[PDB]
Subunit: 105 residues, 4 copies
């Protein structure tokens, strides 16, 4: 089990799970830069709520978008972790698309 | 106390509570497959936020649906844990029904 | 510091804080029934998300209502912990009032 | 790593991060008053959900506003931690502005 500590919030996943998408922060060597030997875990000073959506992506290969979250904050987390371009699931695509436009008016 | 670790988020309930609904993942032997002897807890690489609704069901025998959550992601968690068919409480039935239709258009 | 473990989610407050409102579950002797000597903490198999609003009440003497939460589930937690009648802050009163009516139609 | 325990919820950040904005509770000596030597961490009996937005501010110098949260409860947390005046990001400014007005009608 890999421990991904995001601003105090403990997340845990498998190395194999993350390796599913090389070519992202967590699935590549970029992750090494955030490791803390002393604690045997990776630390990220990022938003712990939005991170749930980042991690979930590794299992489904799909992204869900939380309506209640700010679209800018959401996109920033995707950009940071390398989920680019964003592959939003059909279930969430329209709302994400609509919010992006509204935010850009 | 049974520890249900969902992607790093610790949940705890009673064995008796889960046994209330046999014929679901958590209330049956299916759960054994997710146990980790080394840590004395069960691990699930599933969504930790939506899991609250799964667990709550065992106490009430009823399900609540979070409006802010994606209906597809919600249903996927129900399908995974065996809460099938979903028994949504009257308080949440209509919104769940409406969202399911909208998502299927 | 008093540890209030709600379905795996750790909450911590002061005994003095809870004693502010006698005549509620947490501020009275009713709480003793949920104590676990072995762990030096109280356990509640209740909703860990809604509990934030219960605890917050002790500091302000006022209650906030989360729009995204199901009003029935919300009221059930208030009923369980003895926050009766509910003293919803003016900031949240109307929405709570509106949702209660809608849920009762 | 600095541990900021908010009502039982563990948050962690860097001293350098907090020092970015002197002239706030967390970035100044005001923080000392909340330290607990016995546990080597700071304790705050405040809302653990809204705190995510407080902490995030230190990294971006910008604030996001959660639509689902009560605007009064939100502003109270900003006032308490000294994020005054609030510097809401453009992405969230309008909604925050609108909600403030609605709450003041
Ligand atoms: Zn979705
Ligand atoms: Zn409901
Ligand atoms: Zn309020
Ligand atoms: Zn924003």
């Amino acid at each position: 089990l890999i421990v991904l500590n995001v601003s105090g919030t403990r997340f845990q996943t498998w190395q194999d799970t993350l390796e599913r998408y090389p070519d992202t922060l967590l699935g590549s060597s970029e992750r090494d830069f955030f490791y803390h030997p002393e604690t045997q875990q990776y630390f990220f000073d990022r938003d712990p709520d939005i991170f749930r959506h980042i991690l979930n992506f590794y299992r489904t290969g799909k992204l869900h978008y939380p309506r209640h979250e700010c679209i800018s904050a959401y996109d920033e987390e995707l950009a940071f972790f390398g989920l680019i371009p964003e592959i939003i699931g059909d279930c969430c695509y329209e709302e994400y698309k609509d919010r992006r436009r509204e935010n850009a008016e």
